[PDB]
Amino acid sequence: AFQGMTEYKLVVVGAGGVGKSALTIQLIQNHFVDEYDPTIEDSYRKQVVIDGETCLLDILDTAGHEEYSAMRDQYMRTGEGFLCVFAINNTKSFEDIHHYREQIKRVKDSEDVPMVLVGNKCDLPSRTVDTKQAQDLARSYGIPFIETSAKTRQGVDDAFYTLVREIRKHKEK
Ligand SMILES: Nc1nc2c(ncn2[C@@H]2O[C@H](COP(=O)(O)OP(=O)(O)NP(=O)(O)O)[C@@H](O)[C@H]2O)c(=O)[nH]1
Ligand SMILES: COc1nc(-c2cccc3c2OCCO3)ccc1Nc1ccc(CN(C)C)cc1
Ligand SMILES: [Mg+2]
């Protein structure tokens, strides 16, 4: 029997200040947060319909810098898919993406972990990471790339829905 909607555990990772929380709060509350309040760890839930299937998204919003290693390993083991977020005006956040991805692959002991590359703050004028560079990186990993703005809401739904589609593909192989 059906016992309730399918649940997906999604984790949002990336460097300090790239907009992890702003993306999530835009999804959950349709609200843009202008303030920068560094996260420790926050948990959100949302019911949505993606490709005709109702599902419950359990979303973990993480700290940019994870001081304490055992807590970080736990959410990497529990997460089924990961949004790897950088900011298109912060080159260093883009270079850090490779490190997040390697850490997740190591902890899950798998080459094929559902992931989406997210280039956030695409509303800002001071772009230092080119779209083409980000697409190349994502193509090298075999994952989708999406440009977002937590401010304008561009790509916000798409980033999360695309990640659910990646998790579904991985569960049906
Ligand atoms: N213009 C613009 N600013 C953004 C965007 N996304 C986030 N911001 C801003 O960037 C700052 C940090 O965003 P926040 O969500 O707190 O980042 P975080 O990645 O969760 N930081 P931490 O890792 O410490 O929790 C905030 O001032 C926020 O308004 C965006 O898409 N466009
Ligand atoms: C415990 O279940 C949850 N687990 C996670 C979660 C997702 C991915 C990785 C993780 C996670 O958790 C810790 C370890 O690693 C997120 C939300 C809830 N749950 C949740 C969140 C918010 C509400 C809304 N409620 C506060 C009003 C309800 C359920
Ligand atoms: Mg945050």
Q: What is the distance between the alpha carbons of residues 64 and 152, in angstroms, rounded to a whole number? A: 22
In the chain, alpha helices (H): 20-29, 69-78, 91-108, 131-141, 156-171
Contact 150, 19 (CB under 8 A): yes
Contact 15, 103 (CB under 8 A): no
Question: What total number of domains does the chain contain?
Answer: 1
Asked how this structure was determined, the answer is X-ray
CATH number of the domain where residue 38 is located: 3.40.50.300
Q: Which residues contact 104 (CB under 8 A, 6 or more apart)?
A: 13, 76, 79, 82, 113, 115
Output the CA–CA distances (angstroms, integers) from residue 140 to 136, 137, 144, in the order listed: 6, 5, 10
Task: Output phi, psi for 159, to 5 deg.
Answer: -60, -50
Cβ count near 156 (within 10 Å): 23
Q: What is the distance between the alpha carbons of residues 3 and 6, in angstroms, rounded to a whole number? A: 9
Q: What is the distance between the alpha carbons of residues 165 and 79, in angstroms, rounded to a whole number? A: 15
Contact 24, 60 (CB under 8 A): no
Range of the domain at 17: 1-173
| Mutation choice for ligand 2 from 43, 72, 73, 160, CB with most ligand atoms inside 8 A | 43
Q: For this experimental structure, what is the resolution in angstroms?
A: 2.0
- Beta strands 81-87 and 6-14, pairing class: parallel
Q: Is 121 in the pocket of ligand 1 (CB under 6 A)?
A: yes
Q: What is the distance between the alpha carbons of residues 152 and 80, in angstroms, rounded to a whole number? A: 28
Q: What is the distance between the alpha carbons of residues 13 and 62, in angstroms, rounded to a whole number? A: 6
Which residue puts its alpha carbon closest to atom 16 of ligand 1? 36
Single-letter code of the amino acid located at 131:
T
The residue with tokens 């998204």 is: 57
Counting atoms of ligand 2 from 1, which one is nearest the CA of 75? Answer: 15
Ligand number nearest CA of 32 is 1
Nearest to 57 by CA among 106, 88, 23, 86: 23
Cβ count near 60 (within 10 Å): 18
Nearest to 81 by CA among 11, 28, 132, 138: 11
